[PDB]
From a paper:
Though S. cerevisiae Scc3 packed tightly as dimers in the crystals, those from Z. rouxii crystallized as monomers. Because abrogation of release is the sole essential function of Eco1, the acetyl transferase can be bypassed by mutations that reduce releasing activity.
Sister chromatid cohesion involves entrapment of sister DNAs by a cohesin ring created through association of a kleisin subunit (Scc1) with ATPase heads of Smc1/Smc3 heterodimers. Cohesin’s association with chromatin involves subunits recruited by Scc1: Wapl, Pds5, and Scc3/SA, in addition to Scc2/4 loading complex. It has roles in loading of cohesin onto chromosomes as well as its subsequent release.
Numbering used by the authors:
A (entry chain A), B (entry chain B): 674 to 692, 698 to 710, 720 to 880, 889 to 1059
The structure:
Amino acid sequence: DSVKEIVLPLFYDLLNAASILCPLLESFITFSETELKKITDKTIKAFMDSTIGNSKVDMKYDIFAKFIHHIHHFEKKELQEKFLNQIATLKIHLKKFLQEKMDPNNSRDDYKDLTCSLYELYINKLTILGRDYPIEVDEELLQLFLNNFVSRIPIMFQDFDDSTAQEINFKMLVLLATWNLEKWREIIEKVRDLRSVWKPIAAIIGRLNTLVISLAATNETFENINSLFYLKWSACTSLMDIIVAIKIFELKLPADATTWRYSMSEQFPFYLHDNASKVLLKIFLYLESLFAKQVDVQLERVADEDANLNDLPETGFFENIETEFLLFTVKLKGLMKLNILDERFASRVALNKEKLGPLFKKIV
Amino acid sequence: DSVKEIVLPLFYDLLNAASILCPLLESFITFSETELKKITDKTIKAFMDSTIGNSKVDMKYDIFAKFIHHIHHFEKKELQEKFLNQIATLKIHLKKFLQEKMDPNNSRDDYKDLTCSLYELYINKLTILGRDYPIEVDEELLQLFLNNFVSRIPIMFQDFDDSTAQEINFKMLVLLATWNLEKWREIIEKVRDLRSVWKPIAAIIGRLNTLVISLAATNETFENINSLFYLKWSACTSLMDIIVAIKIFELKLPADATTWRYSMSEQFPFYLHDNASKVLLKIFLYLESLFAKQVDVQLERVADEDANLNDLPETGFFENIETEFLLFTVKLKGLMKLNILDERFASRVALNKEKLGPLFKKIV
């Protein structure tokens, strides 16, 4: 029921936010299928016309996310087609932006403003759409994103402030990989029976491994430390999510897909590089310490842990530290159970299991 | 996709609330269509075992609300039947509750604890279910609720604390009335072309007018004033929502539906009693003055207006006053456009329209 499930919730979201989307709210405040087409068109136009920040900072992100989600569930052919049109447009514009504005030959130095535009105009919008709609990107575009942006974060990073770092995340890469696995699942389930099937996913995992490793080699300062740990965590989390996905995809392959299973070990010599694994543990340790400070618990530590960790600075980047610490632990448990992590890593995770509450204890 | 739309969101919601719902999260912390009916059974069990408070105070309310919503949208016949059984069961136990514990013949005096049980065990859960599932109640149950609880709030009111007041709402009544209109609308629509079809809707509107009037006659104290205005606001908003729903049903009748148009004029003498309309205006006035304090403007008033409005205590009942004020006004504009409110009321609503920021001005 479009009025109960789409139009009214939008109207209430807008009303609550106002106390770009003014002409939308303005429109509702007059009047008294052809109708729905016109509200949806106006809303889609605001979405495409706006800059959308990180949800922690911009109420527009969740307003559009909920609306697009409800539209999707309404399952009306003409509306699905409109959103697929928008995803196509966003990718055309993103490709141009990366080629021109983030060209490594460019002398322009303004990494903080470029990174902001990248996310506010393109990456946040496609990340919202890709929750419900399939998103796919050609090799050219994926390569531009990985080379012109992702690989360059650690040199751009000296220019960032905290709110720019906060915008950066890699959920779009996770989404791209999970939709790609999903396309293959169908082909493999109902093909049954190859050189570069894995190329885009292997490119993404390859790049996240290297980014994690380079961020760890960046010098920590009082000024950059919170944002640097946020970026590490962000890249570690997305990398974990992609590994788990691929691994699970693999477990859901039929016994007679033996060519498929071979091509994966052929094309993924590792999922997690050992040096990236070191940074995973460091981030587990960071969140452990933040969580412990929060609950006034004194942690045990193996001899050689960063003494940074004993009085970390306070951080605006993690608002629910418990959820995040727990969420990160649960993902590390995934990897343990798939044998991606070394037993030494398993031991350290469990070291403080008596001290951090009964939920953490159960997880381990 | 059940795991993507139902199971994972439930797991994350639990996880995030954990930082009687332990045994659910615990199941998730262990393992890796038959499984879905099973999770639905375990979650229904927890839902039925729990006491569910007001959403601002109890995280279980939104947790179960979202799970139930996702289950309904999945539209599997066997899952729908589980929730219809739960609705039938709640109704039976609510009828028993009202007969036994809230019988006016009863010597028990503990109305605050009884009203809490009423909402925590029965009313909150049927309200959650009624968002997606048709809730309908027979005459006996409706009369028990209206006689044994609703019409008695003004005398129970002296025993209440703030957290008990905050728990009372009349949403289930609005939902009862709107499901009833949906049912007529469908029949009118599919069949085409009445002596007591309006009886339950009329009973509800009947009772909400009397309650609003009775609450207005209740003596205010420094102690009870926040909770009193809250109950009055709560009854007024439920009443306005029902009136608007009925009016919209009327307006949507086919012009050859003469027997239908006649039955509404004839079984609805009035929608809003004059004495109840006085209370609507007092509540607009209350919300207007809370908003004005918030923004530090001095309001213009009518010559005889209650100066008390100038010196209102702060309230925890409305922690987004601006939105609440704007929402109440939107509903008033609706009743104005249906010709339920008179020019005096309309003039007063507009009095301070130059002073309360651009959105109120635009609405007015």
